[PDB]
């Protein structure tokens, strides 16, 4: 009724991660997922996983689902925080109000994914990247939904939750105006692997033309080229770097293209850790070098900017996220 798109509510986790729920199996077994635009596979821990990390998670039992289709092909998935091992399985996956038989990794070993797994509340990870970026050559869930004529468009959007402010939404199938204000600008992908686009960057006197920028929901910070960060933090009073929240020397990130301008002010990349010291803030910025000048516009950027990931049009749409809806 009215809402023709599939909306999945998102909850923040200590301002470092955010989760969304989905189900696997004919009996709708529940799971909490990290929604990762940087990967392309879906995985859930199996009832057959007997590692300590799994004892506190919601587990998947294929024997309780009529629709389960055995595969068993051995597979291992790698992430920044580690590796998980298992085998492929296929069963009904439900996301919001949509369902479809989908191939995923049934994880049996998580000891190579610690301490992240045990220290976090999620059960598995749901990839929202491109096919070529996956293992087992599996079409993206949203792409699949589109081919099955279950959604109007092969795109999804992120309106991220903001710690102590409001929850968020992952919307599949269409763009909803209620999530943003200002103009919605599209940036074409420069690669059909990651959601990577080209943008010129300027922080202070330092600048970088046509830098590669990866919009990534799985990264908790904004990553900057080492050299770039160093120069940026010169003369600034910043002893992953911490500083006084009221530091007026803190610069504003500026990202521009032929179609749009995006900025990230200090209030968007500074994390309060007053419990460590009065008015003390952590810099949610990381020095990271890729073969070529690259910025990962992670959660800090996505919290400020509503984003749309368009498979059909091979682009990323960006607009200021509404502060309250």
Curated annotation (Swiss-Prot):
Residues 18-319 form the Peptidase A1 domain. Changing residue 122 to E: Reduces catalytic activity towards host hemoglobin. It is a single-pass type II membrane protein. Not N-glycosylated. It catalyses: Hydrolysis of the bonds linking certain hydrophobic residues in hemoglobin or globin. Also cleaves small molecules substrates such as Ala-Leu-Glu-Arg-Thr-Phe-|-Phe(NO2)-Ser-Phe-Pro-Thr. It is found in: Membrane; Vacuole lumen; Vacuole membrane. Keywords: Aspartyl protease, Disulfide bond, Hydrolase, Membrane, Protease, Signal-anchor, Transmembrane, Transmembrane helix, Vacuole, Zymogen. Component of the hemozoin formation complex (HFC) composed of falcipains FP2A and/or FP2B, plasmepsins PMII, PMIII/HAP and PMIV, heme detoxifying protein HDP and falcilysin FLN. The HFC complex is involved in hemoglobin degradation and detoxification of heme in the food vacuole during the asexual blood stage. Belongs to the peptidase A1 family. This is Plasmepsin II. It comes from Plasmodium falciparum (isolate HB3).
